[model samples]
Target chain A: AHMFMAENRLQLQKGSAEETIERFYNRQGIETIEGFQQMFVTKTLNTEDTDEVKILTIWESEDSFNNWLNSDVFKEAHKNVRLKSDDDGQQSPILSNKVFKYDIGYHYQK
Target chain B: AHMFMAENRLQLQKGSAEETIERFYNRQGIETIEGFQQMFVTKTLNTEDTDEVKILTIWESEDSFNNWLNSDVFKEAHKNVRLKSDDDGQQSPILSNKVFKYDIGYHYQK
Candidate 1:
């Protein structure tokens, strides 16, 4: 079986209340998407840190990911709630986000 | 580094327009919170079925996660958009979401 594959990681930090972030995702219109797999949301123990809050989602392939990124839905979805850091003032909450499009060379179990 | 640690995964399905899903998370008043980690949202390549969209987030430990889950913010955040599957109609989108509290035994590389 193939052990390695392409993966995309999107990280978002919550404002004063994280529920808004969660509720925003729960809304009907935002939930549906083609080539979607799973979304993971995590709260960090170290709240004071910048990279404390993070989200990781896995897709089948890079093409599927690009489809979402290039789509108009992506633009509208992130137009409002996207957080900005005082340090640099970047629009995307995707601090230190990276897309790893690699292949699984080998696999083993012990 | 700790190879094996505790992690929580939350999965959600999109409705029709994936943009709505993306926007919901983008709105303000929803992005801030204590002990919050980055949120990962993903779309599936194989649509035309259940489990199309998914979200995953990672926290430092179960305590941090539990804090968010047992808070009022969580209730409000998920009360609205939370998707309900016709199959069973569960309030939470966490189809296969689970909390894994484990310790890392060993690690090596070749």
Candidate 2:
């Protein structure tokens, strides 16, 4: 087997992303999740961040991402996702957003 | 430089991806873009027969995508991206949307 993939979710978050990025992706749980490989985040639209503030998650197989999604770990992770609201009342730079799937077509060492 | 990537164009095209998929990808010029590496496209938020489309294009570095973006190729390619409107005329199924960047955390070949 080559590779299997999954996922695509878009969102708009306001205000500066201080630790929001860290808290969202730099968690310890994903490390333990099965089949997870790489996760990408960037900004795409207005800024020159080159796909800044967007997300791309890589997995070993489709089942792996599925496992992460189905596990109780997923639930605990996203519990804070909905905490985002306009109440904070802040404006910020537009970040990237997207959803899609694919395989690792090529690889190289940096 | 390892592998730098670009592209997270989220879209929701109605009807089957029969050739829109073909036209979007499977093209000729992409092969010639400097620093171009691999391009992966996926359909999200839909059924097996048809899906909401999401696009990903990988490159040698930010320079590569930047190069492509500045080239005539980029303009010619996107001439159709906004063809979107109800004239056959329709801009509508807004499917899976996303954008973000990440490191190629790990690599394995199955």
Candidate 3:
């Protein structure tokens, strides 16, 4: 597979996934980055109390993903994100988040 | 944005990812199944206590995946798996697993 993926798992307040989707559905600068392949904003199905949203970004390599992390676009894009705090200091819609990195070891396409 | 994915998260004993990879690197009968799009077997990076592997399968839709689950191929393929008990009755390489389903809300490709 020789590819890399960055999975950002976001735990949000109940029934907030639609709002989350609206916020992320537009393109920022990520697509222009070198080695960037695909990005999927995925909503976890059948959640209970919390809505879980995942941002799955695939890259040509780990270095490619790291490049984005180091890029100015990434820096500006995250000016206030951790999935983030509202500028007004009200509670952020996001309850928790975790980022996981993985190497695509095997891939098959039909 | 209309695709569906089945993510199988596997927690394995320390240093066992390679063995696990060997076992799963080959394909069974999944490719011939209708609506099957792709499969990715990913290895988590920088793990400590255990090796974390994720099997991500993409389909045209959730119903497509369900079709596979109902197919003879899937039944035969998973006949002895949950990441499963060994045929020899020894411990499984997988320690724990969780399955998550997702709807591809937004997608961008470069």
Candidate 4:
């Protein structure tokens, strides 16, 4: 099976409205995608900033994922969720993205 | 080696289907049996009203993720994904989950 992995970090500007928007996606994305199998989210403890968030997810294969990513469904679904400077004079969220793909070798225990 | 981390956010109502799962699971739950490692997902630059997605994962130890959420195969592999109302009456296209675990520190850049 094909295995595709990706990770990212979003840094929110102080007092940005995106905070709530950011939280919303973390809880809904899994159900939206079909191949999505497992997911996890956590905050940084040692860091002073609360806006820092991290996540992980496992999928069945790359094709399944690409289907979702390149689909009209995704494009239409996420239209307004763009990051902008806060009206409250807050900073905007910074976004970073990274990805990796691997072939399934063997699960040591499974 | 063991590190446990977690992060989460979700808001699908008001047509928030544009959102993707945001996550941050670091310094936390590492290992399906408490010894797994590395994960990453990224998104945004990325904006609002639309679904934003981002993630990161790292793990190394801890009774190996409690030998399966402390035992048992995640129960039906997720039957129904739950979400709050005012949620666009979208019939259900949302289910977000987040988790993190870490251990194993050294890595090679080469």
Candidate 5:
């Protein structure tokens, strides 16, 4: 069906996943963007080593996702979303992050 | 929504993703199981090294997925789904695979 998904994998310190999960709950400018169908913050289950969090964002097309990347709304939304330290001298809870994109092919639903 | 997703990542030999994608097109007994919501075969975009394919399956709960794991239908479905050489002497397209599960949390829909 050509649905596009962008997964931002956040490698967080141990026991920091819930704190990161709380950051995505409020109203973000992303929801107002066109072709943004859904977003899911998924936490890896049964991990005993590190907290792996993934932010899965679904779009109608890769073009739509690219649009969001270049939009002013995206800049405003991520004004506080960074890997560096904050002004309050608190370090980011996330240890590292990686972005992966995929093209959804051959799907079935019941 | 506490949706659960299991991602089976298939690391295929170079340029073998499309062949692997064709294998999941037909009817499988997984769709008949309760709590089975959807299935998506996703291919990594813009990859020049290898074809990374992921079979993402959405279930109502982990218990529901466990039920399918122990079902006769699952056994019958996998009769030809192993990573070994077939009776025709053709090697499997898949080189390796790993399963990752996640708990979908903090989602928003537009």
Candidate 6:
């Protein structure tokens, strides 16, 4: 099958954006998106940048990712983004989001 | 657990770099590395220039990735890179490889 990778980089007010991502996964993401395979939440241990954590999603294909990207579920997941933010501008909203995709040319498992 | 991401973008001589990556994975990769949770290879559907394919690898930690990076398996994977190149100057060797690390912030499954 074809494959793709989605990357979401986040900023936060606490230790990291782990909880926010988990919440989204629990709510509007994992269960909601079709063709979703697995997800990994990673924190950079050796970097000095502001990006504290990243969300990587594996998809069965680019079409699968696009389906979710344009789906109502995607909007549903982000509906509370504004509400979750602090009115005082102190709450950590995601600083930036970026995506990178690849064809499943080769893969390994161990 | 914590996490990290590695990106390798390659150039090819033909329609895509699919075969080369697959050969690497089958011969010296997937079965060779440790602390490697999973791997995804993707192709850009929208870009027009270079960077036709990207290899994304997920690791349990930077330490895990580093271990593999310094391993003999890593060396073996690239050993034939020079030989594989066409002496006639037409074969495609990877043009560029870039690695981006992220702290996984969120994940999903389906």
Query: Chain A TM-score of model 6 versus the true structure?
Result: 0.72
TM-score of each: 0.35, 0.52, 0.88, 0.38, 0.90, 0.71
Positional deviation of B87 in candidate 4, in angstroms?
60
Prediction 5 global C-alpha lDDT:
0.84
Task: State which docking tier applies to candidate 4.
Answer: incorrect
Evaluated on chain B only, candidate 2 has a TM-score of: 0.66
State the DockQ of every prediction.
0.02, 0.11, 0.79, 0.03, 0.78, 0.53
All-Cα superposition RMSD per candidate: 18.3, 7.5, 2.4, 19.2, 2.2, 4.3
Question: At residue B19, what lDDT does model 4 achieve?
Answer: 38
Candidate 2 per-residue lDDT, tens place, B14-53, comes to: 5644344555534646667877766665544335543444
Docking class of 6: medium
Best-to-worst order by TM-score is 5, 3, 6, 2, 4, 1
Q: Identify the CAPRI category of the predicted complex in candidate 3.
A: medium
* Alpha-carbon runs more than 4 Å astray in model 3: A80-87, B80-87
Model 5 Cα lDDT, one tens digit per residue, B1-110? 48898989998878888888988898758988899888889899888886899998889898888888898988987776756354652588676789999988777878
- Candidate 5, residue B45: the lDDT equals 86
**Cα displacement (Å) at residue B106, model 1:** 30
Writing each residue's lDDT as its tens digit, candidate 4 over B31-108 gives 334454554433332335634333433444445444535554434223244543425535653444344333222221
DockQ of 4: 0.03
| lDDT string, candidate 2, A69-97, tens digits | 78888788766454233344244232333
Clashing pairs in 3: none
List, residue by residue over A18-52, the lDDT tens digit for candidate 4: 35334544333444676766544434444445354
Report interface Cα RMSD per prediction.
16.0, 7.0, 1.4, 14.2, 1.6, 3.0
